[PDB]
Design a protein around this ligand. Structure first.
Ligand SMILES: [Mg+2]
Ligand SMILES: [Mg+2]
Ligand SMILES: [Mg+2]
Ligand SMILES: [Mg+2]
Ligand SMILES: [Mg+2]
Ligand SMILES: [Mg+2]
Ligand SMILES: [Mg+2]
Ligand SMILES: [Mg+2]
Ligand SMILES: [Mg+2]
Ligand SMILES: [Mg+2]
Ligand SMILES: [Mg+2]
Ligand SMILES: [Mg+2]
Ligand SMILES: [Mg+2]
Ligand SMILES: [Mg+2]
Ligand SMILES: [Mg+2]
Ligand SMILES: [Mg+2]
Ligand SMILES: [Mg+2]
Ligand SMILES: [Mg+2]
Ligand SMILES: [Mg+2]
Ligand SMILES: [Mg+2]
Ligand SMILES: [Mg+2]
Ligand SMILES: [Mg+2]
Ligand SMILES: [Mg+2]
Ligand SMILES: [Mg+2]
Ligand SMILES: [Mg+2]
Ligand SMILES: [Mg+2]
Ligand SMILES: [Mg+2]
Ligand SMILES: [Mg+2]
Ligand SMILES: [Mg+2]
Ligand SMILES: [Mg+2]
Lengths: 129, 175, 98, 49, 106, 197
RNA sequence: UUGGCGGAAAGGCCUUGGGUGCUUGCUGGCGAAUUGCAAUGUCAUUUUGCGUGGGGAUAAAUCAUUUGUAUACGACUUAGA
RNA sequence: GCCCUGAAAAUGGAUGGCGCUCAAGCGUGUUACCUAUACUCUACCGUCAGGGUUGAUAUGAUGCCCUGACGAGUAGGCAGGCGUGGAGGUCAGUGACGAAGCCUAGACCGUAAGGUCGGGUCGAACGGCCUCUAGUGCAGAUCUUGGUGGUAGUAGCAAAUA
RNA sequence: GGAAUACUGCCAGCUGGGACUGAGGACUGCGACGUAAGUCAAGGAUGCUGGCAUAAUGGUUAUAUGCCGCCCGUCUUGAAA
RNA sequence: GAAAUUGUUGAAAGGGAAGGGCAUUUGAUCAGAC
């Protein structure tokens, strides 16, 4: 498969959503810090939402790794894929979103002939059977 | 180029472990488990059966026998934490148990190499038991039944099943 | 509960009938077939592309109120791309047979 | 409190009380107390019970 | 015979709590027949099953099990503390659980 | 241990009984309380009647139909103490209160069943001798309950029937004991005695 | 199956006389395995549905028309196959 | 010492509530038990400090590694990063076998700002990295302009004889 | 007169039960046991076994339950006002 | 051809507001992989 690697631990899996993004449509869900002088979220009263902190950060040995155990590298063509030729156990390739189907079949055939895992095969390649 | 390459790559050279310092020493069983003891089975398909303890194996299991004629439990292995040892004892010093080991109960576990009856390919054919197994059962039954004919009601005791009644507190209970 | 009649169970009867009716609804939906099959089933799309347009195209190629239609523009694009893929597979098996 | 437990009626009621039991008397088949009138047949014994 | 039981009955009382904060990771179990912590020390490290039924059959059965273990005693009156693999659903405060006789020592 | 526990409320103290019944209900046991007109409260009759009048005085001033409702039956006085001792606004407390039934007298089908007592709520075990106590039927009759004579007549009828039943069962127990004592001084009786039975 | 009894919410309790099964009260003969060293390892209780299965039972209410002992409108109270 | 009196004001109410009388009250004593983001031990993140490491074939000497301690915060200071419109260079980058945009009870990465993939819609342009530049990031200002609600099928459509 | 037992304290005395954790990754150090090669519980977990191989574990999502949770921005010594 | 706002269909919840946090049950849905 991939390289042997330890168990991956996530200290927080729920998203950090901005306060009152459920009352108003004008308030988006992207995180913004509460800066008001009377804010219960800023003053950290019991029963309110949590805020991002540096203590939540993940282990350096398993950071950026997918559940398979690879790191994702974005690939646009065959030279980009041939960059990853001697690192098939740490990196997995991924075809970019704007590559067409005619070039995706060429990228996938080269990836199979060389041994690189592709995280998104079958994308844009229905009707090929 | 959708991405620029890393300046560094971690090595795909797999490392070896350090020298570990954990040696295997044999089990230290309970002081209520000596061969000849009547045990109560707590889990399994033979729940609540009274069984006779014969031999301690090398994989930390116990060799047990019903006998097969008094309650229908064959020569089996069992785990020592899944059993209750009682204070009744029979004489096991007339039985030869020097042939049973792990390779005796070794099973052809070839189903993990693509079992065509994973669920079932036939759901039938009613698997057959070997004559060597049946003969070992017969000789140990003879040597044990000759000894457990000597105390009264012991055969009836080994035939009957164990169960908890109303108001039976197991922490206050002798066995 | 319900001070007009304190010796009668109210909430537990409501919860009992409620979960019975919910499980009846689930069995009716499963027998009508409005649920996805098993993952190991022979008509499971798990792992592949989910596409309303491709499903409608292949269903009408094989051949009561709904809100999923097909759009002739997209249908012409599907027919063109299928001809491209057929030319590719014909090139492949022509090279293989030669 | 008080609880009613048994009601007994007579064998021959009239059209005025039957009109009381109906809301649309001009359309009805006037079927009221027709099975109850059979309780007085020879023994019957439900009346006496 | 007429009885086939090989477990002890208990009741799920509540979570661990102070007065206005609870802790769903630890449950409190009342074992039937235990009055003291010296008698509850027999049941430490025994396995518990919460057995319940569902209407959708999953893998040959409509009966589902949650597994846990006894960890320590709680208080002066024979209640014990327990942890489960997944925490108990909290609508079962007052429901009954099964304490098995294994892993055995006597 | 029983599926339903039936408690004879004669001679118990009201709050000490309500505390243990509330804990049993929250732990998940079904309780039926009979003879709720025979309960006791510690203190004089006049003092307890004045406490009930202080309760009777409280009502919603702009609409008396919205206010606290003052129920006059002894079973309802007991229920008011129990509802105070549970948290009845939640679904857990509602289910716990739906595990309970309270009656005056012993109606069917509970007049053929076994009734128990609670020793830590009993008046002869808890009150100091010489103290005064109140009876709940008299208190409820003085504050407005109107069925004290009907219940007394029905309870007299039930007592006559259960006295006949007990005479029959006592004669049967006598002949069974005489038949059992003549099979003692047997060999299996001596073996049972050595094993302790 | 023969009788009684039970109205507080009886909805249950007692009994007669024959059929027929079991009996561990005592003594014998076979059987059980492989669920593989545990996995609740599924055992009591219910209301129907598709019409097939057996006798039996053939109704009313509302709108519309009308009255005024009623009425803001609904409602109420009358009449008419 | 304890108890009763030792003056109380107007909606129905408060040892928190139920309730409690050899207490579930008051005085005193001895044990057991319950639980804080506090204490102890372990892991992980970050910051600070003290140190080790020349061999190029293998990487980032701004790297890799070892050890110890610490972490609240308004006004305010400083640092490291995320995103947008244009400019120079590069990837002989992506694109009618479908660019940008928009929708998405699908998937992944990051503490986060955000980034990436799938599907639908669409029909002609647009990105990554190294740098340059600014009319560069909104929930508020009885903000500006445009659009749309509840109120609500409601108030009402009754002067001047028909 | 001769003891014992309480109470307080010590042991580099033995021994049973339960829970949580397993960081690190060739060797290097300090020791222990043995006359010595060796062995070891001595600078951080290994050994043996079973089931399942998919929606089973797990994620997302809609709810239910237990406990907790006042409306944001702003001036003020003082904001749910 | 975005949002506010609205219609139809499907699923759900509802004894005097709704929304939120921690934890799990139930239903629906889903990726990885051996
Ligand atoms: Mg995340
Ligand atoms: Mg302030
Ligand atoms: Mg108190
Ligand atoms: Mg005191
Ligand atoms: Mg303690
Ligand atoms: Mg600190
Ligand atoms: Mg800080
Ligand atoms: Mg600041
Ligand atoms: Mg500009
Ligand atoms: Mg730009
Ligand atoms: Mg091109
Ligand atoms: Mg596009
Ligand atoms: Mg959405
Ligand atoms: Mg970007
Ligand atoms: Mg460029
Ligand atoms: Mg500007
Ligand atoms: Mg803007
Ligand atoms: Mg705005
Ligand atoms: Mg602002
Ligand atoms: Mg405007
Ligand atoms: Mg109008
Ligand atoms: Mg006007
Ligand atoms: Mg006019
Ligand atoms: Mg390790
Ligand atoms: Mg799931
Ligand atoms: Mg789950
Ligand atoms: Mg779920
Ligand atoms: Mg609160
Ligand atoms: Mg404020
Ligand atoms: Mg919209």
């Amino acid at each position: 498969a991939s390289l042997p690697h330890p168990k991956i631990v996530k200290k927080h899996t729920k998203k950090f959503k901005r306060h009152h993004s459920d009352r108003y449509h004008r308030v988006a869900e992207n995180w913004r810090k509460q800066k008001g002088i009377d804010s219960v979220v800023r003053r950290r009263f019991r029963g309110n939402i949590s805020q991002p902190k540096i203590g939540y950060g993940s282990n350096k040995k398993t950071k950026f790794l997918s559940p398979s155990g690879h790191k994702t590298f974005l690939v646009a063509n065959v030279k980009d894929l041939e960059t990853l030729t001697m690192h098939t156990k740490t990196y997995a390739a991924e075809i970019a979103h704007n590559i067409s189907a005619k070039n995706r079949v060429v990228i996938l055939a080269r990836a199979k002939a060389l041994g690189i895992k592709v995280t998104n095969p079958k994308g844009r390649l229905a009707l090929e059977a | 180029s959708a991405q620029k390459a890393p300046k560094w790559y971690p090595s795909e050279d797999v490392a070896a472990l350090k020298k570990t310092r954990k040696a295997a020493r044999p089990q230290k069983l309970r002081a209520s488990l000596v061969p000849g003891t009547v045990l109560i089975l707590l889990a399994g398909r033979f729940r609540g059966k009274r069984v006779v303890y014969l031999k301690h194996l090398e994989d930390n299991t116990l060799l047990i026998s019903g006998p097969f004629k008094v309650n229908g439990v064959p020569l089996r292995r069992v785990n020592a934490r899944y059993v209750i040892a009682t204070s009744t004892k029979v004489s096991v010093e007339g039985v030869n148990v020097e042939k049973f080991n792990v390779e005796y109960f070794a099973k052809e576990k070839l189903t993990k190499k693509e079992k065509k009856e994973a669920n079932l390919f036939p759901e039938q054919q009613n698997k057959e038991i070997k004559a060597e197994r049946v003969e070992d059962q017969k000789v140990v039954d003879k040597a044990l039944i000759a000894e457990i004919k000597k105390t009264p009601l012991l055969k009836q005791y080994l035939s009957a099943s164990f169960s908890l009644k109303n108001g039976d507190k197991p922490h206050m209970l002798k066995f | 509960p319900s001070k007009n009649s304190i010796n009668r169970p109210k909430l537990t009867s409501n919860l009992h009938h409620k979960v019975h009716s919910l499980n009846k609804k689930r069995a009716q939906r499963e027998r009508a077939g409005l649920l996805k099959p098993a993952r190991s089933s022979v008509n499971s799309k798990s792992g592949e592309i989910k596409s309303v347009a491709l499903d409608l195209y292949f269903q009408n190629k094989k051949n009561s109120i709904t809100t999923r239609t097909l759009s002739k523009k997209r249908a012409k694009k599907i027919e063109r791309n299928l001809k491209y893929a057929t030319q590719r597979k014909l090139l492949v098996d022509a090279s293989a047979k030669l | 409190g008080l609880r009613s437990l048994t009601t007994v009626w007579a064998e021959h009621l009239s059209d005025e009380v039957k009109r009381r039991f109906y809301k649309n008397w001009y359309k009805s088949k006037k079927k009221a107390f027709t099975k109850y009138s059979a309780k007085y047949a020879q023994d019957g014994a439900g009346i006496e019970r | 015979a007429e009885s086939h039981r090989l477990y002890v009955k208990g009741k799920h009382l509540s979570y661990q709590r102070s007065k206005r904060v609870n802790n769903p990771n630890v449950s409190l179990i009342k074992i039937e027949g235990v009055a003291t912590p010296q008698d509850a020390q027999f049941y430490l490290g025994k396995r518990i099953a919460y057995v319940y039924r569902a209407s959708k059959e999953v893998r040959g059965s409509k009966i589902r099990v949650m597994w846990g273990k006894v960890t320590r005693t709680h208080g002066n009156s024979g209640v014990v503390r327990a942890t489960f693999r997944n925490n108990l659903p909290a609508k079962t405060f007052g429901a009954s659980v099964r304490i098995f006789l294994y892993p055995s020592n006597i | 241990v029983e599926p339903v526990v039936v408690i004879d409320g004669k001679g118990h103290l009201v709050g000490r009984l309500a505390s243990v019944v509330a804990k049993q209900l929250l732990n998940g046991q079904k309780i039926v309380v009979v003879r709720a007109e025979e309960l006791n409260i510690s203190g004089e009759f006049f003092r307890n009647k004045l406490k009930y009048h202080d309760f009777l005085r409280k009502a919603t001033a702009f609409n008396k139909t919205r206010g606290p409702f003052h129920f006059r039956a002894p079973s309802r006085i007991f229920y008011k103490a129990l509802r105070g001792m549970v948290s009845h606004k939640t679904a857990r407390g509602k289910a716990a209160l739906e595990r309970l039934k309270v009656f005056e007298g012993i109606p069917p089908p509970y007049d053929k069943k076994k009734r128990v007592v609670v020793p830590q709520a009993l008046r002869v075990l808890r009150l100091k001798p010489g103290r005064k106590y109140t009876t709940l039927g008299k208190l409820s009759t003085s504050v407005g309950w109107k069925y004290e004579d009907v219940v007394a007549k029905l309870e007299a009828k039930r007592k006559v029937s259960s006295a006949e039943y007990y005479a029959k069962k006592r004669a049967f127990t006598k002949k069974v004991a005489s038949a059992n004592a003549t099979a003692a001084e047997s060999d299996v009786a001596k073996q049972l005695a050595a094993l302790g039975y």
